[PDB]
Amino acid sequence: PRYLGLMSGTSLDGMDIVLIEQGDRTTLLASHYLPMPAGLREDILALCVPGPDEIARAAEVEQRWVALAAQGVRELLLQQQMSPDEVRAIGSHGQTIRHEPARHFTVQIGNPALLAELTGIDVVADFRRRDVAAGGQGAPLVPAFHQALFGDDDTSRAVLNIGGFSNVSLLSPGKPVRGFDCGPGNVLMDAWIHHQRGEHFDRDGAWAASGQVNHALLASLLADEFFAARGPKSTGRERFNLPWLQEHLARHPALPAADIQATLLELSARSISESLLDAQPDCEEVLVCGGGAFNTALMKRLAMLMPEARVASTDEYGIPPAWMEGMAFAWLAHRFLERLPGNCPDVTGALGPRTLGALYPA
Amino acid sequence: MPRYLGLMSGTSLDGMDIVLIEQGDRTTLLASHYLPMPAGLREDILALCVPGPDEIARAAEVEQRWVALAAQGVRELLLQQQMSPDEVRAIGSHGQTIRHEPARHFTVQIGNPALLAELTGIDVVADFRRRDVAAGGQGAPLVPAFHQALFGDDDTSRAVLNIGGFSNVSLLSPGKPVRGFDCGPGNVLMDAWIHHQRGEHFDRDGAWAASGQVNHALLASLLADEFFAARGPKSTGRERFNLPWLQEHLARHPALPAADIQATLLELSARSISESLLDAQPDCEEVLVCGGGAFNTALMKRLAMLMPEARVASTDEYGIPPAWMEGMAFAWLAHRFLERLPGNCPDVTGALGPRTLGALYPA
Numbered sequence A: 001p002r003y004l005g006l007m008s009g010t011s012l013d014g015m016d017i018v019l020i021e022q023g024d025r026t027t028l029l030a031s032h033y034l035p036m037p038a039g040l041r042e043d044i045l046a047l048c049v050p051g052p053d054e055i056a057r058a059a060e061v062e063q064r065w066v067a068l069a070a071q072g073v074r075e076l077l078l079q080q081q082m083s084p085d086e087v088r089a090i091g092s093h094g095q096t097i098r099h100e101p102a103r104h105f106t107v108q109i110g111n112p113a114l115l116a117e118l119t120g121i122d123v124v125a126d127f128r129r130r131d132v133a134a135g136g137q138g139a140p141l142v143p144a145f146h147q148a149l150f151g152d153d154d155t156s157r158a159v160l161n162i163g164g165f166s167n168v169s170l171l172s173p174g175k176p177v178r179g180f181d182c183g184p185g186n187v188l189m190d191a192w193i194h195h196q197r198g199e200h201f202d203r204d205g206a207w208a209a210s211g212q213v214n215h216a217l218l219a220s221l222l223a224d225e226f227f228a229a230r231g232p233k234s235t236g237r238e239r240f241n242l243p244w245l246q247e248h249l250a251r252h253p254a255l256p257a258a259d260i261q262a263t264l265l266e267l268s269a270r271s272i273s274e275s276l277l278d279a280q281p282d283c284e285e286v287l288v289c290g291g292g293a294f295n296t297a298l299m300k301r302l303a304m305l306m307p308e309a310r311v312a313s314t315d316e317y318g319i320p321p322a323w324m325e326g327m328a329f330a331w332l333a334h335r336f337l338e339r340l341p342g343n344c345p346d347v348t349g350a351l352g353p354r355t356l357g358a359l360y361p362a
Numbered sequence B: 001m002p003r004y005l006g007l008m009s010g011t012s013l014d015g016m017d018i019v020l021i022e023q024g025d026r027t028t029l030l031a032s033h034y035l036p037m038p039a040g041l042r043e044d045i046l047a048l049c050v051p052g053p054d055e056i057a058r059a060a061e062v063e064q065r066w067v068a069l070a071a072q073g074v075r076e077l078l079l080q081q082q083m084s085p086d087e088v089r090a091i092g093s094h095g096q097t098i099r100h101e102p103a104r105h106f107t108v109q110i111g112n113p114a115l116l117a118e119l120t121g122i123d124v125v126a127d128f129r130r131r132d133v134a135a136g137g138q139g140a141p142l143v144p145a146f147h148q149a150l151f152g153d154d155d156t157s158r159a160v161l162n163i164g165g166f167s168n169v170s171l172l173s174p175g176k177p178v179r180g181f182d183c184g185p186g187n188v189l190m191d192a193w194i195h196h197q198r199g200e201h202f203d204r205d206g207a208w209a210a211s212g213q214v215n216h217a218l219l220a221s222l223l224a225d226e227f228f229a230a231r232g233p234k235s236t237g238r239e240r241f242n243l244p245w246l247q248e249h250l251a252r253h254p255a256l257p258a259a260d261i262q263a264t265l266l267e268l269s270a271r272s273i274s275e276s277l278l279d280a281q282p283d284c285e286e287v288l289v290c291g292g293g294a295f296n297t298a299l300m301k302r303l304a305m306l307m308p309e310a311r312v313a314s315t316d317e318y319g320i321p322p323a324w325m326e327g328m329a330f331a332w333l334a335h336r337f338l339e340r341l342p343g344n345c346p347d348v349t350g351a352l353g354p355r356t357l358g359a360l361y362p363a
């Protein structure tokens, strides 16, 4: 059977649409990227902070989100010369607008009934909430998929997503899959360069690379309680955001903006490397996915901070780093429909294995 | 002959209805259980029915408590019936409407079905309205398909009329597609007015209304609302009919006695039902009344007088308790989802066509 996966992550760069075949293997068949319209991007970011009239605002924003998703699905199908009927189901994450696992809730918008109506394909959606209901963080969910791809008897591996947020899957032989969110990935580097220069992101980490790390600031940032925590943990824009950074910056006289950028890159690399090696000290291979894999400067620093391990993108292993998250949700649709568990209890802290998501039939 | 639970909490927020049916060749009400709505939860839910601050966080927390209460209701029914959760195929859960905006193409029912599934250990089918809305429909009312299944009769033009917080009718005309719509306020304003004035949750038997005098001028002004003039598919809710709405009209006429305003509100519900029902189904022979309005003696008497051509009676007279019809309908829709039989009526909702309604959250 073939499955579509739809992901729109933290970074709000665009929508990912993937087509896989699931048999004994998971094979990527096709992909399609649609950049996020600037208006829709702003309207989603506006829902990530508490504000007024959120029920109505969210209901309208998610109509536009779903329409874009359905358009992307249509475009992939046309490109591949396939009918919808050839696809078993779409696995749709939706869009996170609030993540408060401490308060036992997570909010992904993306009106699945409307996605089913527009695409003519069954939709499996709302994957995180059964994990949270069972006492879990609800995140990260990719570890079960990372296992399916890269679980190796002889090799101690970390599979590292660097999206807006970073998260790692620890694949240790003869051990439960573990993992967690490491902290910020691209989110603060993207925020800072956009705040300062109106750029979307820091191309190849060049701006960061042109600056010097500021020790006082780095120490300030790394002392956030999130970094000290071990075991299951998940985060989001609730914690790591421009106001948070500004608060730290206020405690010292002004710095060059590129030094701040440089420190933000070091924050990402340090929080990742230290949480990864704290959990899996005998790691021999770090398999990097997400768009952070294209930040040359970041990838260099990760290799330096983890000299024991080979740091490489998943491309080496036949999986494009950009499409890993899309692939995961396609996979999760399959897991739903076969009634196999989608969470990893030692990742999320949930009471046990759970079937994740909900079916909206065409 | 599988068994389904139905879980419903309507706009009146009086409480939570849990039903158990068997769905063989026909629908059989096996059991029911009623939970009063805790006062704090009722207020928290109402607070979400009007635009306000921090709604995403407030709704997420409120629904935790709604689901916990629903789950305890399910447990209590199963304990009373000496049943295991494994004996139930699925729960059909409407959730709780907090916003209904058909003209903006959205409707919002809270009630975290994944948590409901976790807590009950029973498969949940929820989120019934949004596929109909997706297909261009009102999303409401959804009972007509169930009403047709229960009471469809090729000999008799019947109307099945729910009088809850809001009123809605199912028009079962022999040889014709099922039609229907919300009629207007049911109990919502009579409840709101007596609570506003005296702190009562409802006007028992419509005795307070009956003591007052209908104000014909005020009545005409209320019935002049554009909603009442619309025909075909239409749906409404607290967004339209609420205390501010009444008060804008009250600031037309002099300082009326509160009992006269209550009498007027009763007549408003009676006239809006009678006028819309008769307009759509002049041939109506029987009006079968369900929902809590069936228990308002004064209202039922007025409906009878305003529709002298039809036999007006509660569904009790036809072997379904008026109180439990809605819960039964959602249990039935869980069934329809599983069998992939359509849940909507396009000539009711205005949708493009028949649709499978709801979403499955497996235990």
Ligand SMILES: Nc1ncnc2c1ncn2[C@@H]1O[C@H](COP(=O)(O)OP(=O)(O)NP(=O)(O)O)[C@@H](O)[C@H]1O
Binding pocket: A007, A008, A009, A010, A011, A012, A013, A014, A016, A162, A163, A164, A165, A186, A187, A190, A200, A201, A202, A203, A204, A205, A289, A290, A291, A292, A294, A295, A296, A322, A325, A326
């Ligand atoms: N050439 C590059 N140099 C530096 N950073 C890059 C480059 N290309 C992409 N990025 C970063 O990667 C980010 C987007 O990665 P992505 O993995 O799509 O994030 P996401 O949206 O949070 N996750 P997803 O759901 O997988 O799309 C951008 O915002 C940039 O910060």
Ligand SMILES: Nc1ncnc2c1ncn2[C@@H]1O[C@H](COP(=O)(O)OP(=O)(O)NP(=O)(O)O)[C@@H](O)[C@H]1O
Binding pocket: B009, B010, B011, B012, B013, B014, B162, B163, B164, B165, B166, B167, B186, B187, B191, B201, B202, B203, B204, B205, B206, B290, B291, B292, B293, B295, B296, B297, B323, B326
């Ligand atoms: N004895 C009675 N006399 C008068 N009114 C009554 C009586 N018993 C119940 N009611 C009314 O019935 C209402 C509740 O009916 P119910 O059928 O539970 O509505 P609901 O389902 O919550 N609303 P909705 O979702 O709009 O259909 C109460 O708020 C009262 O107004």
Ligand SMILES: CC(=O)N[C@H]1[C@@H]2OC[C@@H](O2)[C@@H](O)[C@@H]1O[C@H](C)C(=O)O
Binding pocket: A009, A010, A096, A099, A106, A138, A139, A140, A141, A142, A143, A161, A163, A164, A165, A166, A167, A180, A181, A234, A235, A236, A325
């Ligand atoms: C609540 C939420 O949307 N978390 C995202 C986010 O983006 C990265 C990281 O934080 C991860 O934990 C999760 O996404 C990926 C797809 C996951 O669940 O594995």
Ligand SMILES: CC(=O)N[C@H]1[C@@H]2OC[C@@H](O2)[C@@H](O)[C@@H]1O[C@H](C)C(=O)O
Binding pocket: B010, B011, B097, B100, B107, B139, B140, B141, B142, B143, B144, B162, B164, B165, B166, B167, B168, B182, B235, B236, B237, B326
């Ligand atoms: C949006 C919404 O929840 N509408 C309710 C309300 O309560 C009565 C009436 O207005 C009806 O249209 C509907 O409920 C019943 C259960 C229905 O869908 O038939």
